[PDB]
Design an enzyme around this catalytic site. Structure first.
Site, PDB file in Angstrom:
ATOM      1  N   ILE A  72      -2.642  58.691   0.607  1.00 22.25           N
ATOM      2  CA  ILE A  72      -2.121  57.695  -0.017  1.00 22.25           C
ATOM      3  C   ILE A  72      -3.371  57.390  -1.254  1.00 22.25           C
ATOM      4  O   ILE A  72      -3.001  56.503  -2.205  1.00 22.25           O
ATOM      5  CB  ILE A  72      -1.644  56.333   0.668  1.00 22.25           C
ATOM      6  CG1 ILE A  72      -3.140  55.764   1.651  1.00 22.25           C
ATOM      7  CG2 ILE A  72      -0.586  56.435   1.373  1.00 22.25           C
ATOM      8  CD1 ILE A  72      -2.779  54.338   1.972  1.00 22.25           C
ATOM      9  N   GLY A  73      -4.300  57.674  -1.273  1.00 23.07           N
ATOM     10  CA  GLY A  73      -5.362  57.435  -2.289  1.00 23.07           C
ATOM     11  C   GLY A  73      -6.308  58.433  -2.183  1.00 23.07           C
ATOM     12  O   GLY A  73      -6.770  59.239  -1.201  1.00 23.07           O
ATOM     13  N   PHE A  82     -15.436  59.336  -3.142  1.00 21.29           N
ATOM     14  CA  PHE A  82     -15.846  59.363  -1.858  1.00 21.29           C
ATOM     15  C   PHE A  82     -15.147  60.134  -0.843  1.00 21.29           C
ATOM     16  O   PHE A  82     -15.643  60.351   0.345  1.00 21.29           O
ATOM     17  CB  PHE A  82     -15.578  57.910  -1.289  1.00 21.29           C
ATOM     18  CG  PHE A  82     -14.364  57.483  -1.310  1.00 21.29           C
ATOM     19  CD1 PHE A  82     -13.649  57.623  -0.284  1.00 21.29           C
ATOM     20  CD2 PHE A  82     -13.396  56.779  -2.514  1.00 21.29           C
ATOM     21  CE1 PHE A  82     -12.162  57.267  -0.408  1.00 21.29           C
ATOM     22  CE2 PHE A  82     -12.373  56.451  -2.285  1.00 21.29           C
ATOM     23  CZ  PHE A  82     -11.527  56.726  -1.307  1.00 21.29           C
ATOM     24  N   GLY A  83     -13.862  60.578  -1.061  1.00 18.65           N
ATOM     25  CA  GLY A  83     -13.176  61.061  -0.047  1.00 18.65           C
ATOM     26  C   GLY A  83     -11.712  60.939  -0.193  1.00 18.65           C
ATOM     27  O   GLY A  83     -11.182  60.819  -1.251  1.00 18.65           O
ATOM     28  N   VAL A  95      -7.905  58.905   1.495  1.00 14.81           N
ATOM     29  CA  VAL A  95      -7.215  57.834   2.369  1.00 14.81           C
ATOM     30  C   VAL A  95      -5.810  58.204   2.640  1.00 14.81           C
ATOM     31  O   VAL A  95      -4.902  58.590   1.892  1.00 14.81           O
ATOM     32  CB  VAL A  95      -7.439  56.394   1.547  1.00 14.81           C
ATOM     33  CG1 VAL A  95      -6.584  55.301   2.436  1.00 14.81           C
ATOM     34  CG2 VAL A  95      -8.603  56.092   0.767  1.00 14.81           C
ATOM     35  N   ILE A 150       0.698  47.147  -1.225  1.00 13.81           N
ATOM     36  CA  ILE A 150       0.754  48.122  -2.344  1.00 13.81           C
ATOM     37  C   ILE A 150      -0.194  47.407  -3.311  1.00 13.81           C
ATOM     38  O   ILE A 150      -0.487  46.206  -3.261  1.00 13.81           O
ATOM     39  CB  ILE A 150       2.133  47.878  -2.808  1.00 13.81           C
ATOM     40  CG1 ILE A 150       3.333  48.704  -1.830  1.00 13.81           C
ATOM     41  CG2 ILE A 150       2.332  48.606  -4.194  1.00 13.81           C
ATOM     42  CD1 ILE A 150       2.857  49.959  -1.384  1.00 13.81           C
ATOM     43  N   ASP A 161     -16.727  46.017  -7.250  1.00 13.11           N
ATOM     44  CA  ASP A 161     -16.017  46.982  -7.858  1.00 13.11           C
ATOM     45  C   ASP A 161     -14.506  46.791  -7.750  1.00 13.11           C
ATOM     46  O   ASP A 161     -13.709  47.656  -7.086  1.00 13.11           O
ATOM     47  CB  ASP A 161     -16.416  48.334  -6.993  1.00 13.11           C
ATOM     48  CG  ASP A 161     -15.640  49.729  -7.488  1.00 13.11           C
ATOM     49  OD1 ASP A 161     -15.167  49.733  -8.703  1.00 13.11           O
ATOM     50  OD2 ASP A 161     -15.160  50.419  -6.584  1.00 13.11           O
ATOM     51  N   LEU A 162     -14.118  45.521  -8.227  1.00 18.26           N
ATOM     52  CA  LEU A 162     -12.813  45.003  -7.839  1.00 18.26           C
ATOM     53  C   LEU A 162     -11.790  45.456  -9.094  1.00 18.26           C
ATOM     54  O   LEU A 162     -11.176  44.596  -9.493  1.00 18.26           O
ATOM     55  CB  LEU A 162     -13.079  43.377  -7.577  1.00 18.26           C
ATOM     56  CG  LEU A 162     -11.830  42.822  -6.844  1.00 18.26           C
ATOM     57  CD1 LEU A 162     -11.199  43.652  -5.800  1.00 18.26           C
ATOM     58  CD2 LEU A 162     -12.255  41.307  -6.313  1.00 18.26           C
ATOM     59  N   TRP A 208      -8.022  46.813 -10.272  1.00 19.32           N
ATOM     60  CA  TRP A 208      -6.732  46.488  -9.554  1.00 19.32           C
ATOM     61  C   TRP A 208      -6.314  47.585  -8.557  1.00 19.32           C
ATOM     62  O   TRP A 208      -5.098  47.097  -7.910  1.00 19.32           O
ATOM     63  CB  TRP A 208      -5.826  46.346 -10.689  1.00 19.32           C
ATOM     64  CG  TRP A 208      -5.204  47.168 -11.731  1.00 19.32           C
ATOM     65  CD1 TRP A 208      -5.686  48.573 -11.752  1.00 19.32           C
ATOM     66  CD2 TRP A 208      -4.135  47.109 -12.479  1.00 19.32           C
ATOM     67  NE1 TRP A 208      -5.228  49.366 -12.731  1.00 19.32           N
ATOM     68  CE2 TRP A 208      -3.970  48.246 -13.168  1.00 19.32           C
ATOM     69  CE3 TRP A 208      -3.230  46.252 -12.748  1.00 19.32           C
ATOM     70  CZ2 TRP A 208      -2.984  48.702 -14.296  1.00 19.32           C
ATOM     71  CZ3 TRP A 208      -2.376  46.305 -13.658  1.00 19.32           C
ATOM     72  CH2 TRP A 208      -2.102  47.628 -14.557  1.00 19.32           C
TER      73      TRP A 208
HETATM   74  C1  LIG Z   1      -3.931  54.005  -4.285  1.00 19.30           C
HETATM   75  C2  LIG Z   1      -4.538  52.739  -3.983  1.00 19.30           C
HETATM   76  N1  LIG Z   1      -5.317  51.907  -4.930  1.00 19.30           N
HETATM   77  C3  LIG Z   1      -3.581  51.732  -3.060  1.00 19.30           C
HETATM   78  C4  LIG Z   1      -2.835  52.570  -1.607  1.00 19.30           C
HETATM   79  N2  LIG Z   1      -4.228  52.602  -0.789  1.00 19.30           N
HETATM   80  C5  LIG Z   1      -4.032  51.784   0.308  1.00 19.30           C
HETATM   81  N3  LIG Z   1      -5.513  51.734   0.808  1.00 19.30           N
HETATM   82  N4  LIG Z   1      -5.466  50.867   1.762  1.00 19.30           N
HETATM   83  C6  LIG Z   1      -6.378  50.336   2.809  1.00 19.30           C
HETATM   84  C7  LIG Z   1      -7.901  50.694   2.426  1.00 19.30           C
HETATM   85  C8  LIG Z   1      -8.303  51.710   1.625  1.00 19.30           C
HETATM   86  C9  LIG Z   1      -9.415  51.879   1.542  1.00 19.30           C
HETATM   87  C10 LIG Z   1     -10.444  50.954   2.253  1.00 19.30           C
HETATM   88  F1  LIG Z   1     -11.783  51.408   1.974  1.00 19.30           F
HETATM   89  C11 LIG Z   1     -10.041  49.828   2.882  1.00 19.30           C
HETATM   90  C12 LIG Z   1      -8.609  49.858   3.159  1.00 19.30           C
HETATM   91  F2  LIG Z   1      -8.353  48.777   3.893  1.00 19.30           F
HETATM   92  C13 LIG Z   1      -5.565  49.528   3.556  1.00 19.30           C
HETATM   93  N5  LIG Z   1      -4.202  49.360   3.190  1.00 19.30           N
HETATM   94  C14 LIG Z   1      -4.253  50.342   2.016  1.00 19.30           C
HETATM   95  S1  LIG Z   1      -2.885  50.708   0.915  1.00 19.30           S
HETATM   96  C15 LIG Z   1      -5.322  53.404  -1.413  1.00 19.30           C
HETATM   97  C16 LIG Z   1      -5.720  52.990  -2.513  1.00 19.30           C
END
Ligand SMILES: CC1(N)CCN(c2nn3c(-c4ccc(F)cc4F)cnc3s2)CC1
Length: 346
Positions: A38-39, A43-44, A46, A158, A197-198, A200
């Site tokens: 999903i991302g 860094f790597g 997710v 999301i 690093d906030l 969106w």
């Molecule tokens: C594409 C994106 N902007 C939305 C979907 N996406 C998600 N990442 N995460 C995380 C999460 C991820 C990293 C982290 F350091 C801590 C976390 F808690 C928890 N729930 C979700 S949805 C990946 C990034």
């Protein structure tokens, strides 16, 4: 030589381990089969999966090896420790009393695993590359002695970018800004926290049936209307905090590429933060939280499409107030100063 061993013992101790464990101890077959990517970042990777009938997000970071990964050298044990400590501390704020907020994200567990990358994760990686496209190297070149940090988070929803067109009204926008400001204020008060690093993609939104959300700032409890959404702030790779005078932070003072980006206000913020701290990243400058809130308010005003009615006098008034917040918030010193003194929240 002894310092490398000390750094390693500190990371293994954060993981409740004596040494590395195999990927399987942490991601058995069933959990791997349900992974979807999903991302990503330099860094790597997710992934989203299910653990005991609950969704979770798993962040996997290669550490301590010599190969270049996504154009950068891997973090050492010493360099990965801050993200681990900060993720733990911010997860605790949901259960505290004097300074309490649900606005960060829960950290279920953290592990240090050893192995080549699982084929099932490569298959998830490939599917993401085929559909969304990827900037990273396919992670198939790691050997069976490679170490990774695996962080397992509560699933937070999301991101704000992908909710661009799904917010109901300007009331929802104001609630999101109020939630973000309050969470950052509680972390400032508890931990002298800066996120740093906030953007969106690091603001997550989940539907909630709760009508009012609660936080406590220095012993005083307050409420925020949810407008049906609960905000979670994620990703503490660049963050800073302190406990009893001991600072935990990402030392980016030798990092050059972070300050050479272009095409977005996001990259001007890194340069402004560096200007304001004289490149001394252990110092506490809570104004950086205000800078990021200002960037997020710009997104709210310029990139969002609302589902409900916008020409009502009430919604037009909210828009005028968010515009006034946007043009005055940079005159406040911290998220705490904004929360307690800005007219938007009165
Ligand atoms: C594409 C994106 N902007 C939305 C979907 N996406 C998600 N990442 N995460 C995380 C999460 C991820 C990293 C982290 F350091 C801590 C976390 F808690 C928890 N729930 C979700 S949805 C990946 C990034």
């Amino acid at each position: 030589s002894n310092k490398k061993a000390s750094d390693a013992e500190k990371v293994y101790g954060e993981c409740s381990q004596k040494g590395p464990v195999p990927f399987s101890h942490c991601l058995p077959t069933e959990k791997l089969q349900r992974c979807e990517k999903i991302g990503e970042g330099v860094f790597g990777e997710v992934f989203q999966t299910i653990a005991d009938h609950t969704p979770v997000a798993i962040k996997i970071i290669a550490i301590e090896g010599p190969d270049l990964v996504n154009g950068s050298h891997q973090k050492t044990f010493e360099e990965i420790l801050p993200e681990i400590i900060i993720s733990k501390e911010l997860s605790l704020l949901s259960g505290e009393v004097c300074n309490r907020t649900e606005g960060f994200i829960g950290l279920n567990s953290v592990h240090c695993v050893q192995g080549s990358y699982p084929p099932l994760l490569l298959k998830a990686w490939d599917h993401y590359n085929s559909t969304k496209g990827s900037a990273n190297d396919r992670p198939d070149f790691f050997k069976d002695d490679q170490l990774f940090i695996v962080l397992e988070f509560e699933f937070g929803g999301i991101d704000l970018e992908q909710m661009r067109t799904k917010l109901s009204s300007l009331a929802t926008a104001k609630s999101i800004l109020h939630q973000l400001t309050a969470s950052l204020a509680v972390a400032e008060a508890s931990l002298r926290f800066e996120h740093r690093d906030l953007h969106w993609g690091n603001v997550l939104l989940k539907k909630t049936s709760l009508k009012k959300l609660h936080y406590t700032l220095n012993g005083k409890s307050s409420t925020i209307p949810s407008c049906g959404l609960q905000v979670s702030i994620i990703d503490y790779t660049l963050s800073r905090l302190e406990r009893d005078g001991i600072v935990v932070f990402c030392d980016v003072s030798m990092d050059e590429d972070l300050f050479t980006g272009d095409g977005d206000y996001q990259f001007d913020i890194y340069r402004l933060m560096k200007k304001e701290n004289n490149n001394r990243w252990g110092e506490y400058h809570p104004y950086s939280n205000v800078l990021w809130l200002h960037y997020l308010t710009d997104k709210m005003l310029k990139q969002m499409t609302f589902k409900t009615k916008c020409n009502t006098p009430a919604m037009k008034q909210i828009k005028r107030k968010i515009q006034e917040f946007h043009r005055t918030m940079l005159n406040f010193s911290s998220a705490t100063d904004l929360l307690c003194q800005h007219s938007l929240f009165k």
